[PDB]
């Protein structure tokens, strides 16, 4: 299965890529909202882990845009942890929303849960 990791912070992207690689997933990365939409269209990932505070296009806009044509599972992963943040992310189409800092094991379990459908 292929995972697209969207995060503008390379250190965070690297930790998630390391962990998902360990589970046997193919990993593709994007460092801004524009790269996120470009990788989504070119790679057709099976699941997207999506940061919200991103340059060019924010994660909420990336999710809304992607939802116009795809039901690809989206797991939002952000330091933004307010009730409004989680509710709007889910209402715009996210299937799950995890806050930073996060547990690598819990992220792995939620990706498996989403892929399980």
Instruction: Return residues touching ligand BEF (CB under 6 A).
Output: 51-53, 78-80, 100
Of 2-10, 29-37, 88-96, 102-110, which segment contacts Mn ion by CB under 5 A? 2-10
Q: Which is nearer to Mn ion, 101 or 115 (CB)?
A: 101
- CA dist., res. 52 & res. 68, Å (int): 18
Of 15-23, 32-40, 50-58, 69-77, which segment contacts Mn ion by CB under 5 A? 50-58
Q: Which is nearer to ligand BEF, 12 or 72 (CB)?
A: 12
80 binds, among ligand BEF, Mn ion, none (CB under 5 to 8 A by kind): ligand BEF
| Phi and psi angles of residue 111, each rounded to the nearest 5 degrees, phi first | -65, -45
- CA dist., res. 108 & res. 117, Å (int): 14
Is residue 35 a contact point for Mn ion (CB under 5 A)?
Answer: no
**Binding residue for Mn ion, selected from 51, 95, 97, 114, defined by CB under 5 A:** 51
User: Do 115 and 1 touch, CB atoms closer than 8 A?
Assistant: yes
Which string of b and e fits 58-79 if b means at least 16 CB within 10 Å?
A: bbbbbbebbeeeeebbbbbbbe
- CA dist., res. 110 & res. 32, Å (int): 23
Task: Report the interface residues with Mn ion, using CB under 5 A.
Answer: 8, 51, 53
């Amino acid at each position: 299965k292929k995972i697209l990791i969207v995060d503008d912070e390379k250190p965070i992207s690297d930790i998630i890529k390391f962990n998902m690689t360990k589970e046997g997933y193919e990993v593709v990365t994007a460092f801004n909202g524009r790269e996120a939409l470009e990788q989504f269209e070119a790679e057709q990932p099976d699941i997207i882990i999506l940061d919200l505070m991103l340059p060019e296009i924010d994660g909420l806009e990336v999710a809304k845009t992607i939802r116009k044509t795809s039901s690809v599972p989206i797991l939002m992963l952000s330091a933004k942890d307010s009730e409004f943040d989680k509710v709007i992310g889910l209402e715009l189409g996210a299937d799950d929303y995890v806050t930073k800092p996060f547990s690598n094991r819990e992220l792995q379990a939620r990706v498996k849960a989403l892929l399980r459908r």
